[PDB]
Subunit: 253 residues, 4 copies
Amino acid sequence: MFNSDNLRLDGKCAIITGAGAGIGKEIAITFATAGASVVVSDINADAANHVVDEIQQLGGQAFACRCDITSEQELSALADFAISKLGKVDILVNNAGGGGPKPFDMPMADFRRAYELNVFSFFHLSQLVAPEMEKNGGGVILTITSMAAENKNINMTSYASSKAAASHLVRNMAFDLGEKNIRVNGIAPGAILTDALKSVITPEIEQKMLQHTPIRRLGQPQDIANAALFLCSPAASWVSGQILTVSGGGVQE
Amino acid sequence: MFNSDNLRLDGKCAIITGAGAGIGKEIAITFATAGASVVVSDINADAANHVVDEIQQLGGQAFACRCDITSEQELSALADFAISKLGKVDILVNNAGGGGPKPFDMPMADFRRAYELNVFSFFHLSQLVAPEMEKNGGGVILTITSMAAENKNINMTSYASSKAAASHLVRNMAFDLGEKNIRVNGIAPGAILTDALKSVITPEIEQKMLQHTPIRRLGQPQDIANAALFLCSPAASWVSGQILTVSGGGVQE
Amino acid sequence: MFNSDNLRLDGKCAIITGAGAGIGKEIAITFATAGASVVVSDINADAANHVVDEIQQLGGQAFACRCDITSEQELSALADFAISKLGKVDILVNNAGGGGPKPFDMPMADFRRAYELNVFSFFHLSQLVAPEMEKNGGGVILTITSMAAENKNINMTSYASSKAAASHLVRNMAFDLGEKNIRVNGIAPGAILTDALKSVITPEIEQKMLQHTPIRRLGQPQDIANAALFLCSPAASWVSGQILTVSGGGVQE
Amino acid sequence: MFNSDNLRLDGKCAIITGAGAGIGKEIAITFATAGASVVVSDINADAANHVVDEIQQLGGQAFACRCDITSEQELSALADFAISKLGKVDILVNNAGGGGPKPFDMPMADFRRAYELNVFSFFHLSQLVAPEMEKNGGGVILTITSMAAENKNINMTSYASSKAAASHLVRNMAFDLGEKNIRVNGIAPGAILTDALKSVITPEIEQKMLQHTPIRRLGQPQDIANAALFLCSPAASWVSGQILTVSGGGVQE
Ligand SMILES: NC(=O)c1ccc[n+]([C@@H]2O[C@H](COP(=O)([O-])OP(=O)(O)OC[C@H]3O[C@@H](n4cnc5c(N)ncnc54)[C@H](O)[C@@H]3O)[C@@H](O)[C@H]2O)c1
Ligand SMILES: NC(=O)c1ccc[n+]([C@@H]2O[C@H](COP(=O)([O-])OP(=O)(O)OC[C@H]3O[C@@H](n4cnc5c(N)ncnc54)[C@H](O)[C@@H]3O)[C@@H](O)[C@H]2O)c1
Ligand SMILES: NC(=O)c1ccc[n+]([C@@H]2O[C@H](COP(=O)([O-])OP(=O)(O)OC[C@H]3O[C@@H](n4cnc5c(N)ncnc54)[C@H](O)[C@@H]3O)[C@@H](O)[C@H]2O)c1
Ligand SMILES: NC(=O)c1ccc[n+]([C@@H]2O[C@H](COP(=O)([O-])OP(=O)(O)OC[C@H]3O[C@@H](n4cnc5c(N)ncnc54)[C@H](O)[C@@H]3O)[C@@H](O)[C@H]2O)c1
């Protein structure tokens, strides 16, 4: 039978990478509003700090930490800081990442970078928290991937190849971590109208993207926040190694 | 921000196939307990009625109809009964259907039958309830597919191909019905310990299926009911054409 | 090292369903030209018969047989006739099939039909030849599926769902038949400019379809004939359970 | 109509990574024997040179270069040597690369390295030879990926994710290079019995891997060389962005 408390994160401690803005910001707020203590990580400290007061204005407890996910040194620091501020780590939502469409002849530096963001940082950070989660008898890791991980188009070599790596790592990491009773899942956002896109997108552009979405509307960060909550909640206790695409049933071009 | 009402089905009217036992019974009870009025359908009216009684005891509203999904006549009869008893239809949970390991040399009757159970039935009923969902302004159709739809093995020709047909039906159907604000999704459950297997299973046999499952415990009907709720709740309003697997990150032989 | 005879069908006997025209016609000719005796099956006898003289004009030996693949009675007849005319059956290429885009509210008859063509006939015919192939110690089954089996778009419910069933049957049948030392593979044609499309397609239409194909050109039946030869040849002796998409790297819309 | 010349590489110039042994060596010999001039590259010049000698003995033209694919400098040096010795480049067979089972707690050095071996190397070399292929009017790049790219298991985080990255690189890269008439494909080989394993394997161990393979025999290097030939031969001129698995229809543990 239905049980609302299974849909909440009461007493949980979560790290949310790149949560100073966009989808990441919504996950942080939505998680704190469901009962979990949160460490809001982001390179843009001022942004991270805004999210924190914003959570307190709601009564949740958040802490800010600047952290370049691409710096191994900052990742271990993020981890030590999180275990000190919250006392433990139950949830890790690896949101930060990116890269973008690029020509085939981008310098290798551009190529290597997508991996730092989408693959290596994600993997190093899990290695850091995994021991903590295993100490407490379990935990949940959630990464935000992308639909590029499953589509193919021009100028997507690095971004698409990296996101694919991350999605497949999820499927395998689910096995290594499963022993430590840690679930690992991912979510592939469609065209999320994060405030950034929201500012540029022309009503003509919108129609062009929504041209192939059955549920004719652009996504909102919340859509991704709802999916994350479910996947990180106890209601999803036997769900591991999955990638949930949240994109209205189609693809935005 | 976290909104608990988005995770409830207040005033939603759901039809649920094969709800006398196992997975369907639990989705019926979880749904009804989350605020929706439900029609419990089943080839076993005794079972359906018991489930209805039990739902009412918990203070939920529910109605029972003995329906054999392999009958076109009986499928229309199910739709009329729901229109008649609930007044409208917002959610269809196509749970019944089946088939299992069959010799390559099985009689064609047996082969086609797996299609009756998982494909033709599911599609027709969708045709029946679609027109009713659109007049309410939207809806959610959800199927209980299978991991056989994604796996490969011996003695699975009928069973696995039909579940594969059903799973790709979800993806395509999401396009057609997307213009009528209807979302279509499915769930691929692993080895779920339903009251039947619960007594056919022996602790020995168990350590074998679980041999390749990261989250080392067999599934409970609640796990599936939990994902169906989310997938049919307004919180997953931009999730369509997806097939979520709940198997603890592995495959139970 | 390279060995041309491994790329030929010398001494092989092949059944080619729906070979009176299109892709099917090319497979027949290309196979006979590589050394195999062929039974050219098709509902349009005159077409089947043309292909046969055409093969003889090249020195290959073909035999015609009218056969509605959707009639169980005609399938067993096709089989008995093939084993009588050729002496044995080494290769089965299940080309005939079809169905097409259809609205969600097509009558059920339309839905059931796609399955007769794409799934049931294919499965019944394999059941019929499998015993013959097993007698000779091996064989090869090849089905022509479609890209609909992997894409999702509006008005594709039946066609797409059926082709998906067929592709997944390939993956599983590979296990049942593997014991009988029979390989089973499929090929998913992209937009093949079969003489039919070739007659209607406007130079403007062409551009529209080729809009998303990296190798900017429409396919030719031969392209599919080359793939089939490889997959049915000894060079592909450890290749089973595969679906090869031949579509220039993209999709034609 | 069957055309044997389409299945040959006469006057084609191919570069082949890790061609001193196993799979690469055989693709080198099969290619050279099918009419193309080949550059045999390898971190082991002794091995490369022996393979070159052996090729010449069979009357084919070949050249050897000791190249360590993990070096950007050495990759450019390989491209110059091929341009210098063969005059042009029409085919690139990226065979080397690797990595294997690694503990979740592996050092990041080991993790990144799997990316050096299967991702970064493969991409860069593609960048190097692309410009040369387009000036000849076309080309074919082909990678030796892995079944780990599609599977899930314990102790495969690095190995499997990098092969997944490489496999999705094929799909996307096919778009970019498609405008320059360059086709990109890959092959996922199963358990191939190469001269090394050939002596490390014990008849006991063999009956175990083969336990779930329909075509019950381990793969031979020829099987892979056979598919690479076809995939690089003009006969597969409309096949791009594909990843063919050669594993006898199953998975060898
Ligand atoms: N918005 C979309 O439409 C969309 C679609 C598909 C996938 N995604 C994925 O979702 C994730 C988040 O995307 P978003 O759209 O919210 O992005 P965004 O760039 O708007 O926000 C990223 C947040 O992370 C911060 N950040 C950037 N680099 C960082 C670093 N190196 N270390 C720590 N923090 C850093 C930014 O300041 C920002 O607050 C990414 O992994 C992205 O690949 C987004
Ligand atoms: N339980 C598992 O481990 C598992 C795993 C994978 C897929 N599934 C899927 O879940 C669904 C239910 O499986 P389950 O094991 O919970 O089922 P079950 O055998 O318990 O059947 C559930 C209910 O359906 C009823 N029913 C059977 N045939 C019917 C018909 N023809 N018309 C109407 N009602 C009918 C049964 O009497 C029962 O009350 C199926 O779609 C099955 O493929 C279950
Ligand atoms: N042409 C394309 O672009 C394309 C694309 C994707 C998939 N396909 C698939 O390829 C296969 C063959 O397609 P095609 O394009 O050559 O088709 P087609 O309709 O041009 O030719 C089919 C041939 O089979 C015959 N046929 C029709 N029904 C038959 C039946 N019931 N029994 C026996 N023979 C019958 C027809 O007379 C004809 O000679 C089909 O399974 C189709 O789904 C084709
Ligand atoms: N053999 C199998 O069962 C199998 C299965 C799956 C994938 N593969 C793939 O096939 C490819 C070759 O595998 P294999 O077992 O045949 O390989 P292998 O270990 O025999 O290596 C082949 C050649 O590559 C050379 N080489 C190694 N590192 C190199 C480097 N850094 N730079 C240049 N040359 C180098 C080796 O010395 C050897 O001569 C790899 O991509 C591997 O992932 C093989």
